[PDB]
Design an enzyme around this catalytic site. Sequence first.
Site, PDB file in Angstrom:
ATOM      1  N   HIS A  52       0.855  -1.165   0.000  1.00 55.04           N
ATOM      2  CA  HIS A  52       0.000   0.000   0.000  1.00 55.04           C
ATOM      3  C   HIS A  52       0.892   1.215   0.000  1.00 55.04           C
ATOM      4  CE1 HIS A  52      -4.095  -1.694   0.513  1.00 55.04           C
ATOM      5  NE2 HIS A  52      -3.447  -2.710   1.050  1.00 55.04           N
ATOM      6  N   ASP A  56      -0.220   7.021  -3.232  1.00 54.03           N
ATOM      7  CA  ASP A  56      -1.459   6.751  -3.939  1.00 54.03           C
ATOM      8  C   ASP A  56      -1.850   7.884  -4.871  1.00 54.03           C
ATOM      9  OD1 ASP A  56      -1.888   4.225  -2.809  1.00 54.03           O
ATOM     10  OD2 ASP A  56      -3.507   4.901  -1.460  1.00 54.03           O
TER      11      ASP A  56
HETATM   12  C1  ACO Z   1      -6.780   2.825  -0.546  1.00 50.04           C
HETATM   13  C2  ACO Z   1      -5.434   2.162  -0.460  1.00 50.04           C
HETATM   14  O1  ACO Z   1      -4.643   2.436   0.431  1.00 50.04           O
HETATM   15  S1  ACO Z   1      -4.976   1.023  -1.598  1.00 50.04           S
HETATM   16  C3  ACO Z   1      -3.268   1.277  -2.001  1.00 50.04           C
HETATM   17  C4  ACO Z   1      -3.032   1.269  -3.505  1.00 50.04           C
HETATM   18  N1  ACO Z   1      -1.908   0.427  -3.872  1.00 50.04           N
HETATM   19  C5  ACO Z   1      -2.087  -0.841  -4.258  1.00 50.04           C
HETATM   20  O2  ACO Z   1      -2.851  -1.573  -3.649  1.00 50.04           O
HETATM   21  C6  ACO Z   1      -1.308  -1.343  -5.467  1.00 50.04           C
HETATM   22  C7  ACO Z   1      -2.246  -1.804  -6.589  1.00 50.04           C
HETATM   23  N2  ACO Z   1      -2.009  -3.131  -7.167  1.00 50.04           N
HETATM   24  C8  ACO Z   1      -1.784  -4.271  -6.486  1.00 50.04           C
HETATM   25  O3  ACO Z   1      -0.669  -4.574  -6.095  1.00 50.04           O
HETATM   26  C9  ACO Z   1      -2.913  -5.251  -6.211  1.00 50.04           C
HETATM   27  O4  ACO Z   1      -4.051  -5.061  -7.087  1.00 50.04           O
HETATM   28  C10 ACO Z   1      -3.339  -5.302  -4.726  1.00 50.04           C
HETATM   29  C11 ACO Z   1      -2.161  -5.716  -3.849  1.00 50.04           C
HETATM   30  C12 ACO Z   1      -3.881  -3.959  -4.276  1.00 50.04           C
HETATM   31  C13 ACO Z   1      -4.475  -6.298  -4.546  1.00 50.04           C
HETATM   32  O5  ACO Z   1      -4.156  -7.577  -5.101  1.00 50.04           O
HETATM   33  P1  ACO Z   1      -5.185  -8.809  -4.975  1.00 50.04           P
HETATM   34  O6  ACO Z   1      -6.437  -8.338  -4.264  1.00 50.04           O
HETATM   35  O7  ACO Z   1      -4.413  -9.971  -4.403  1.00 50.04           O
HETATM   36  O8  ACO Z   1      -5.668  -9.114  -6.481  1.00 50.04           O
HETATM   37  P2  ACO Z   1      -4.806  -8.807  -7.814  1.00 50.04           P
HETATM   38  O9  ACO Z   1      -4.841  -7.318  -8.122  1.00 50.04           O
HETATM   39  O10 ACO Z   1      -3.523  -9.599  -7.736  1.00 50.04           O
HETATM   40  O11 ACO Z   1      -5.730  -9.521  -8.932  1.00 50.04           O
HETATM   41  C14 ACO Z   1      -7.103  -9.153  -9.103  1.00 50.04           C
HETATM   42  C15 ACO Z   1      -7.926 -10.425  -9.198  1.00 50.04           C
HETATM   43  O12 ACO Z   1      -9.306 -10.135  -9.444  1.00 50.04           O
HETATM   44  C16 ACO Z   1      -9.732 -10.717 -10.682  1.00 50.04           C
HETATM   45  N3  ACO Z   1     -10.686  -9.798 -11.350  1.00 50.04           N
HETATM   46  C17 ACO Z   1     -10.540  -8.472 -11.540  1.00 50.04           C
HETATM   47  N4  ACO Z   1     -11.631  -7.945 -12.164  1.00 50.04           N
HETATM   48  C18 ACO Z   1     -12.509  -8.947 -12.381  1.00 50.04           C
HETATM   49  C19 ACO Z   1     -13.856  -9.102 -12.992  1.00 50.04           C
HETATM   50  N5  ACO Z   1     -14.534  -8.056 -13.519  1.00 50.04           N
HETATM   51  N6  ACO Z   1     -14.406 -10.334 -13.005  1.00 50.04           N
HETATM   52  C20 ACO Z   1     -13.781 -11.401 -12.486  1.00 50.04           C
HETATM   53  N7  ACO Z   1     -12.566 -11.335 -11.915  1.00 50.04           N
HETATM   54  C21 ACO Z   1     -11.883 -10.162 -11.833  1.00 50.04           C
HETATM   55  C22 ACO Z   1      -8.473 -11.033 -11.470  1.00 50.04           C
HETATM   56  O13 ACO Z   1      -8.604 -12.217 -12.260  1.00 50.04           O
HETATM   57  C23 ACO Z   1      -7.445 -11.245 -10.372  1.00 50.04           C
HETATM   58  O14 ACO Z   1      -7.396 -12.601  -9.939  1.00 50.04           O
HETATM   59  P3  ACO Z   1      -6.129 -13.540 -10.266  1.00 50.04           P
HETATM   60  O15 ACO Z   1      -5.029 -13.051  -9.354  1.00 50.04           O
HETATM   61  O16 ACO Z   1      -6.690 -14.897  -9.895  1.00 50.04           O
HETATM   62  O17 ACO Z   1      -5.858 -13.353 -11.746  1.00 50.04           O
END
Ligand code: ACO
Lengths: 354, 354
Positions: free
Chosen positions: B120, B150
């Site tokens: 995060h 962010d």
């Molecule tokens: C408010 C805050 O403080 S948030 C801080 C912001 N910073 C971040 O979080 C960095 C952003 N990116 C990331 O690293 C990540 O997306 C995280 C760590 C935030 C979250 O990761 P996770 O929740 O483990 O899921 P991740 O993003 O890896 O994958 C999304 C999943 O949802 C699924 N998905 C997404 N959209 C859809 C949809 N419309 N339909 C079906 N499935 C979906 C994907 O297939 C994926 O699953 P998979 O890993 O089996 O392929």
Amino acid sequence: AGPLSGLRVVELAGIGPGPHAAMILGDLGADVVRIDRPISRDAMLRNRRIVTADLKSDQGLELALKLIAKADVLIEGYRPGVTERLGLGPEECAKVNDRLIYARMTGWGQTGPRSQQAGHDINYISLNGILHAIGRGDERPVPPLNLVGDFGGGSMFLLVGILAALWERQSSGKGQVVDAAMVDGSSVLIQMMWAMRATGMWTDTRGANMLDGGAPYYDTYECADGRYVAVGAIEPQFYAAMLAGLGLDAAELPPQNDRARWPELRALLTEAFASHDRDHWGAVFANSDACVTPVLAFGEVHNEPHIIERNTFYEANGGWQPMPAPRFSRTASSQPRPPAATIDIEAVLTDWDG
Amino acid sequence: AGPLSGLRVVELAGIGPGPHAAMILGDLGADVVRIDRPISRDAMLRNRRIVTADLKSDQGLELALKLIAKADVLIEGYRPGVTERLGLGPEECAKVNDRLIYARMTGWGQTGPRSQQAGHDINYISLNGILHAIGRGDERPVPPLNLVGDFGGGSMFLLVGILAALWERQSSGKGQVVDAAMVDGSSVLIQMMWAMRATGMWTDTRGANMLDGGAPYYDTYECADGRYVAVGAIEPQFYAAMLAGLGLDAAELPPQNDRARWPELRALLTEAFASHDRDHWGAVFANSDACVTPVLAFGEVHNEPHIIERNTFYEANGGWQPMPAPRFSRTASSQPRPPAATIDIEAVLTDWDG
Ligand SMILES: CC(=O)SCCNC(=O)CCNC(=O)[C@H](O)C(C)(C)COP(=O)(O)OP(=O)(O)OC[C@H]1O[C@@H](n2cnc3c(N)ncnc32)[C@H](O)[C@@H]1OP(=O)(O)O
Ligand SMILES: CC(=O)SCCNC(=O)CCNC(=O)[C@H](O)C(C)(C)COP(=O)(O)OP(=O)(O)OC[C@H]1O[C@@H](n2cnc3c(N)ncnc32)[C@H](O)[C@@H]1OP(=O)(O)O
């Protein structure tokens, strides 16, 4: 070489947000020409050409207007009325170039009771509720450097405005004025807390919220060596991964989001992290989703593998400087050109064909 | 209504930076269509059309690709490889729309040892020296909310990327991929401290610098009523106006930039400010260049005349939300449209002609 290659920018030498927006345009390939008062070691002034003119003189006014006539963007960061009084206000600029994106960078804005008042970053974020929200609850608020007003909610909003208006220009054929006030930008920057306030998910109490250091799972901890780790384990599977690495039994701990026992929870995490040094915890939480990272001091940043591997910084006489952000797959920005000697304004005018 | 009227954006429902970038595009006139997993109270989701699709199904993937075929910009904020494995990666999208600006919002970036790790805001700013720079020197670093990673160095660079690439598209006729990593953006956001480190004007010691709360003329002070003012009086003439307001004889104080006597200087300023309430100092300084402002809590922001007069906020359902920033003189942004019910994806596709 980046996406903004071809874009012509006139920057009127200022301080803070203006030169930072101007740097980022240059970073991404724009041709930025900076006009200063009649070879710099400020790395912020990378990717420019520097020229000099007394804007208060008839020659200097004429030359600057000739320069603005051939530009796409004008950046100025003085008090409202200053460019006007010089003869370089929007309406004068419109006369020689109505395709001009006239970008006005201020803290208070162009109008209103405070628009003529001096200030800096800390003042602008003090008046919109931001500054009050930053720091420990048992203390007076601490400034988040000048990241929020000047840059995050200042220069970044100037850029969005600038590029937004260039998009508009494609259909209309005309520029306009961008009024970029740090007081506005920073409010939009912090819109999340305003959204959350309305639904009971954020409080006006300092250091007693999820992302302000109130949550034991979203905070720094001090280690055995006096150094720090950052914990960001919001989601339960991440939080669990974090406890696993610390070797803590979840059944012996208060629930993650029982706020009534957050002091107890923090005291147990504090004891855990205090038991080894920062580098130990980076080895422990190596590839994991525990959201635990070392808090690096600026000087150690260049030794970090992820930083090194992605070339986030380059060396420039003096030390490390950040590479252009963000990245583009087809038109990649170049490594920034060092500040260079001042050149003759006439040379630029011929170059621009003016 | 604003500058980006006409721009078509597909946002893949994420958290943090992605939705905030998409919000700002909507604020400025863009046609933003958000796809969520199979009517919202979150004001961040203003200025959208909400549709839903299981991207893991044949139907949902087909529909989404039809939507993307008709858009200018795709925003995704998942781990690297996720869109790929969905069939929505850049090379798939290129097949149906080579004018697409494919905007990838991450903390770590697309590649590198940490690119698959959960994180995060606090984690991304911890690794680049920023978090270490924030807070009082006698204490462990405090998070500047999620303003810097962010938003300031996250969403804002996504935006600049997006709009910059749209500029490039006008000459080349093609889109490309925007790799926006919070670790990169936030470094460029803090470029000033990296510039100043190189010339002896910034140190790695926390709370011992000009803009981090180490300078008595750049910090908050507690008043008689337990509330605070912010002092931002860097320049000598502002510093002087500040001392005049306080009724302090400069000849009886240490010099403003005599760091050896900064404790003594702060103790005198502290005693002065403590003698009256915040709003007395509000009054004594409301009009001058002393760079002294009241530190407002979120809740009192809407009562401040400068805030009111410029309409920095509007009331939505419940409380105050920030108006679009920056401002545009010819194509002004509208008041944001509230979150609305989910709409059928087909309806959008007919609207976009797809
Ligand atoms: C408010 C805050 O403080 S948030 C801080 C912001 N910073 C971040 O979080 C960095 C952003 N990116 C990331 O690293 C990540 O997306 C995280 C760590 C935030 C979250 O990761 P996770 O929740 O483990 O899921 P991740 O993003 O890896 O994958 C999304 C999943 O949802 C699924 N998905 C997404 N959209 C859809 C949809 N419309 N339909 C079906 N499935 C979906 C994907 O297939 C994926 O699953 P998979 O890993 O089996 O392929
Ligand atoms: C990194 C940081 O800490 S910066 C924080 C952000 N602060 C801001 O920049 C907010 C917006 N700007 C301001 O409020 C103000 O410009 C301040 C407070 C920074 C400075 O205030 P001042 O210097 O007193 O006034 P201001 O900058 O408006 O005026 C500049 C003067 O220089 C003159 N000038 C500027 N360039 C030239 C030139 N090339 N040749 C001749 N004259 C020039 C202007 O015409 C003007 O003169 P005037 O007052 O006679 O009209």
